[PDB]
C-alpha cells in the first residue's frame, strides 16, 4: 500500500514537473513574442486605475 | 529403595520434560527468526521492484 502511495506520489511529481518543465516552453516564447509581437508602445491604457 | 527409586524417577522425568521444552522453544525461535528474515528480504525485494516500476 505504501508502494502504491509512492507510485501515486511519483505520478503527481511527474504532473508537477510537466508544468515545471513548461517554464522554458512558455517563458522564452513570451519573451520572444514581447520582443516581436508586442514591439513598442504595448502599454494599453490604464484608465480604470 | 522405593523412596530412592521414586526420587530418581521424578528427577529423570523433570529433566526429560525440561529438555523437550527447551528443544521445542529453540526450534520455534529458529523458525521465527528464519521467517522474519525471509519476510524482510521479500519486503525489500518488493520495494525495489515497486521503485523500478515507478521509474
Alpha-carbon gap, residue A26 to A32, rounded angstroms: 10
Please report where in the chains the cell 519476510 appears, as a residue: B39
Q: B53 and A7 in contact (C-beta within 8 Å)?
A: yes
Q: Is A43 helix (H, G, I), strand (E, B) or coil?
A: coil
Q: A10 and B54 in contact (C-beta within 8 Å)?
A: yes
Cα distances (Å, whole numbers) of residue B38 to A3, B26, B47, B48, B54: 19, 18, 14, 15, 24
Alpha-carbon gap, residue A38 to A27, rounded angstroms: 14
DSSP annotation of A40 reads S
Resolution stated for this PDB structure, in Å = 2.9
Q: A5 and B53 in contact (C-beta within 8 Å)?
A: no
Cβ-defined contact of B50 to A10 (cutoff 8 Å): no
The technique by which this structure was obtained is cryo-EM
Q: Which helix (H) or strand (E) holds A27?
A: helix A23-33
DSSP annotation of A22 reads T
* Sequence-ordered alpha helix ranges (H) in B1-55: 2-54
DSSP annotation of A36 reads I
What are the chain A neighbours of B53 within 8 Å (beta carbons)? 7
**A7 vs chain B: nearest CA distance in angstroms?**
6
Supply B31's cell numbers. 523458525
Exposed e or buried b per residue across B27-41, where buried means at least 16 C-beta atoms within 10 angstroms of its C-beta: eeeeeeeeeeeeeee
Amino acid at each position: 500500500a505504501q508502494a502504491e502511495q509512492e507510485r501515486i506520489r511519483m505520478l503527481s511529481e511527474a504532473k508537477s514537473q510537466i508544468a515545471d518543465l513548461v517554464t522554458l516552453t512558455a517563458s522564452r516564447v513570451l519573451g520572444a513574442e514581447l520582443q516581436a509581437r508586442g514591439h513598442d508602445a504595448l502599454i494599453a491604457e490604464s484608465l480604470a486605475a | 529403595e522405593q523412596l530412592a527409586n521414586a526420587r530418581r524417577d521424578y528427577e529423570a522425568e523433570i529433566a526429560r520434560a525440561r529438555q523437550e521444552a527447551a528443544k521445542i522453544v529453540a526450534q520455534a525461535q529458529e523458525r521465527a527468526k528464519q521467517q522474519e528474515a525471509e519476510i524482510i528480504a521479500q519486503a525489500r525485494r518488493e520495494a525495489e521492484r515497486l521503485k523500478e516500476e515507478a521509474r
